Design a protein around this ligand. Sequence first.
Ligand SMILES: Nc1nc2c(ncn2[C@@H]2O[C@H](COP(=O)(O)OP(=O)(O)OP(=O)(O)O)[C@@H](O)[C@H]2O)c(=O)[nH]1
Lengths: 111, 73, 847, 84, 74, 98, 77
Amino acid sequence: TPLYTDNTANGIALLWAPRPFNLRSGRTRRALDIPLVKNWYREHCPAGQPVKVRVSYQKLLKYYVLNALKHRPPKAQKKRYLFRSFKATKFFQSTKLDWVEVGLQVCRQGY
Amino acid sequence: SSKMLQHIDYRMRCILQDGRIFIGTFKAFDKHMNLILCDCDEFRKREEKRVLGLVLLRGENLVSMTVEGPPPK
Amino acid sequence: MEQTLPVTVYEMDFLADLMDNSELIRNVTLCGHLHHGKTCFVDCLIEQTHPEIRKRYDQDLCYTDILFTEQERGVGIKSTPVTVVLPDTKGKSYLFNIMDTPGHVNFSDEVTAGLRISDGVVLFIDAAEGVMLNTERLIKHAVQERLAVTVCINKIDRLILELKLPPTDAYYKLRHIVDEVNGLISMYSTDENLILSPLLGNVCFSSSQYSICFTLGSFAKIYADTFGDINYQEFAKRLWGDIYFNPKTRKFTKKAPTSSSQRSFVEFILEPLYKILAQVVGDVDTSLPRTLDELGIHLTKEELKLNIRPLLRLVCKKFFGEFTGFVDMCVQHIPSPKVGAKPKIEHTYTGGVDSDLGEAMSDCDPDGPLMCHTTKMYSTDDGVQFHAFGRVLSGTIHAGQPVKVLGENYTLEDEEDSQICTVGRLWISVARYHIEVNRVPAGNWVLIEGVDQPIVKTATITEPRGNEEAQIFRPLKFNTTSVIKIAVEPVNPSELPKMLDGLRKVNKSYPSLTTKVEESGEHVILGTGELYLDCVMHDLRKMYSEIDIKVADPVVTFCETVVETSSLKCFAETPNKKNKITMIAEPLEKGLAEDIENEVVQITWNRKKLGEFFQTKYDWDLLAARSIWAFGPDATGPNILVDDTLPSEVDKALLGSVKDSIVQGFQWGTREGPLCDELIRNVKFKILDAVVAQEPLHRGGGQIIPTARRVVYSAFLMATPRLMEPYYFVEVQAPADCVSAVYTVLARRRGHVTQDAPIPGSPLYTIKAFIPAIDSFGFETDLRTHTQGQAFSLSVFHHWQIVPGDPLDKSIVIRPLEPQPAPHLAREFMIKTRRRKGLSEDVSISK
Amino acid sequence: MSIGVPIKVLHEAEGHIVTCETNTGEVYRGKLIEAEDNMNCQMSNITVTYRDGRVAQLEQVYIRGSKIRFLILPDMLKNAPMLK
Amino acid sequence: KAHPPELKKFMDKKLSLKLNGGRHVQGILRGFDPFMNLVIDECVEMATSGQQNNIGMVVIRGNSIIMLEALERV
Amino acid sequence: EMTPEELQKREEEEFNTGPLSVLTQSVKNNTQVLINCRNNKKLLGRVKAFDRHCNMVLENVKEMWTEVSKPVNKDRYISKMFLRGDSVIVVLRNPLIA
Amino acid sequence: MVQPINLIFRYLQNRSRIQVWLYEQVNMRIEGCIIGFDEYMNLVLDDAEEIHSKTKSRKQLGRIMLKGDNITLLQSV
RNA sequence: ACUCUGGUUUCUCUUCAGAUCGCAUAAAUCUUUCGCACUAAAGAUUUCCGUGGAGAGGAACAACUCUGAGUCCAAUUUUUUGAGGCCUUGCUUUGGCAAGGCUA
Ligand SMILES: Nc1nc2c(ncn2[C@@H]2O[C@H](COP(=O)(O)OP(=O)(O)OP(=O)(O)O)[C@@H](O)[C@H]2O)c(=O)[nH]1
């Protein structure tokens, strides 16, 4: 067995990658549940930026801490889904449309 | 060798080369047939019982063995 | 027995029957630098002896950092004993009493408490970091306490996964670590029989995160189990050093066959491990099953789906198995309680081995007189009752057996400190669950209930109605000195008794805690550092006393000294105006005070050896060299009392009548000190004329002692008094770029950098510097914040140095809330300390 | 698959008190120091009883493994993990 | 697989070696083999007749060895 | 052993040119064979199969042994049996009387 | 450290008057001049003579090949 | 080394879940606290976005990889022999047993 392969240096660098890049399997998340900049404002306030930027950093951190602190356990319940109930009745039907068409339909319906 | 794993924990009397009788609880055995017998007693002939305990006998002197008592609790 | 316990690989009946055979017991303490891997090892072993207790996939179950603050801080704070039955390489089982000790430099007292009741030491060293500050300190402490020393080079995976060194350079790094340890041991010890080398089995290599632990013998045994026909013991003797394998001749030579030939350790041990780790972390999907087939490991399908770290742990666990190399090390090179009893009695027993009780204790015979020594006190979570913990050096302790408990002041003539108590229960201590037992023979560690009432720090438990000539074991000699001082006071003065009770309880918990009540009614706690006092106050406010306690600003303890000889020879007379003493004070020679405190010299020596030592070491004539009366406030205080009274001027026989009182007066005077009620250090007191009243009714008792104390004070005050700061020794590890930032942080706090140097084989640097203790509060936080957390420092007390200013100078004006310039720091340190103590605002320099 | 359980049990007996009966009918009771895969026993502090019944004291003894009839082990070894 | 029996503690050591046919032999050990066949320096016969007979350099089959005792302290 | 080859038929070359070929003779030519065994007993019969251990199976055998009184040799008949190899002293093909 | 098989080797080098006991036969000893051994310590003895202890009749056997399973201990002269 | 389970995917239904049930983080109501309540904190309840576990039913293709289970050793150290024969005493269950002395 050779000491190192062509994917040994890269495979070690994955040990220290930030989550989820240190994983090799996992459960899919919703698109809106992934904050892409949450680890940006958790860093130190950047010196040299104008005062508005630093105040924005601190204000983001404030709501982050409040969310983490005021967090409450998700209550136990019984699975009841609205859209399954809608499809069960005879008043609704299913199809597959372009997103833009559905956006236009929702706009007109709300109007 | 299942023919003796079936006999484990059974109260076994083994006959020795010199005529010695060893009654005790069969615990373990190996390929050379060295026997592990716990709370073992030896019966010699004039009747007399000498309580010994945990005996590891070499396969050399072991001759013949027989179940005498069911496994205890 | 009869206690619901986690199921073990062994059975507790075997454990109980092992305790009787003192040749199968190993009393081991795990020690090392901070965060050097000492705790997984315990679970890394608990798991292997507890099928159901496993470590979480994403979180390590410390299982011995059982405390709250231990679990959040992730820092070892208190020693946790573990008693497990561990199999050997040959399949034999031994009972192991393991002391998991904290690695933080502030909590060294827990390490000494563990060292007292242990026969051997397993020093843990990070493979990447190397030998750090606490590793050297613990090596010194262990070889001084006469303990067998072994080394476990933990975290070897960092050489592979983090640093990615070539296997040969990893071998160089390991050899360099071993050589550094050997050099330290030879520095602190004279006899050679403590050579550490993996050829002797002294050194183990391990990576607790990935369940790797092997000596040379255990790896050779892996080879032998795979290929039957090799003798692993002789194989292991060729697996280290500059010995190369020649595959053509199938023999190991001291010369490398041709070129590009690797040493035996690299070829047979380091390269396979490198390849295993590389395969697991790089080719888990491609070429892992094939290599696992080659090694004979078969992993199930859902097992191959694990993340890389759990998969590596699992693969290495399958390949290596149990930690038999560690047990081999500790069985071969750590004495059993029966064999190690004699040095233990020689060192830690006041009666000496020669004593009749000393002999029976040195036999470690469990049918002899009871002699149990307790050094740790563990509090139940309710915080009301404590449980003493210690080893039974002789006899056998029973549950319900009345016992005689001896304190630390108990002597064979002052038998008032002893107290009869009744043992309630006995637990074989494991990290989390206590296994209750009915009796504990000699050579074992036992948790005792019912003897906690009359003991503060340590005790010796014997039997009533026998063992009349039973003395005590020496109180623990700690590595450091408690210097950082804080004052406490309840918010509501009504609940003062509650805070006093809490103070007693914390004094019981922390071995080196010193709680005292000053003259001004001020309660003072002495600690080693900021973390130490933080955790002490956390326990005090939340665990033992449920009241609110105010905390004063941290301050240090000072010492008083002189810098020349007294101008005019002082004199002081008794109120009878008959007895008169004349003394002068001069500074001691350089390096003599340290000799005195470190017991290089003892007044227990005959006058001949004292005289010859002083003559050959500090240019003292025989007259003065044999003239020593006392040795400072204690038996080893840094001050000396010398009589220069001529035989013609004063009759020496009459002087002998007042020698025994002048000694006491001088000891008390040095204990208090005239400046700010602090200890006197590095001062030599010479008596010049001692006029003695012939009538014994005039001298002796309460007339000559105060005169001696007053003359000591006055003689001290003529020669220019100075204050002394405690100086801290800081070691900082930081990357190359942050070294300048470390310099900048140090420069602001009167810091003086001694040396910076690279860490061989690591990308970091070590900066060693000296900082005044008082100019050190928040230094760790300043360093870790200015460097964005990339620099970390541990500080430990080193020595005493003179404050720049002159304490006795009224010309200096100090404002209440401004930092003072160095030219007059001493004046502030003196007057503010006097105000804190409640004394007058200034001294009255006089005769 | 290679080394039998009884040899392992004998390995466990090291350090305890053991009584040894060789084919010459000689009984050796003493502290078992070491044992090998074969019954070669290095054992100490021997109270030795001959066939006639004479008792002697002999501090160091090394018995060839081929020449042991049986070995009586201490009862606490009945709790060895290897006997489960 | 024939591991050498552990007699290094009994090296250079005066020993009494009893035999199969009630014979007994004394001398100092100088080496062995995995079959424990035993070499003796300054060997003394001292048969059951009660008279000690000295030989010197001798080598014994291990198959007839019953029991090995170190007369001198090891 | 210097010959660890799997296709090992040297044991029957022992049964053709070696000392054990004597009993293979009685296997092929079927003559009465006399056996002297360790209990001071003698066995006469016909051998059918055996191996390197010299343990063999016989048929229609007469065994005689003497008992002291003073030594009188008794005889008992056994139809078919099997002797362990190590329990023998000598093996004899009965001589040609003609 | 000195290895039995090698001792047979020098015994055949010296052609010493090697005497060998017998397994369990205390009465009968054999003397002779050794020539060779093997991995099983079977020996060839040139001028061999049986020695008893009760009759003590020295009977010459010529050259012999005493089995290694029967030897007990080799003595010189 | 020969045979018998277990599959995976998808849709629906039922129950439990204080587990970062969710590596994310809304809204409403009530109470308390001080300001003087988007620019504010605490406690509690509720609703929403949407989960895991188990169980049940439906329907689409894989069926023995995996998880299991049932299915070459005669020469010292053990299993390819130092075995058997003679003498005395106590008791003979008159077969001989027990110990010792022997010969091989
Ligand atoms: N890379 C690596 N990290 C390890 C290894 N073993 C432990 N660690 C980690 O290093 C840190 C050491 O923590 P502990 O092992 O609890 O520390 P300790 O040695 O007990 O020392 P104290 O904190 O003084 O109690 C933790 O983050 C461990 O998870 C190892 O083998 N390799």
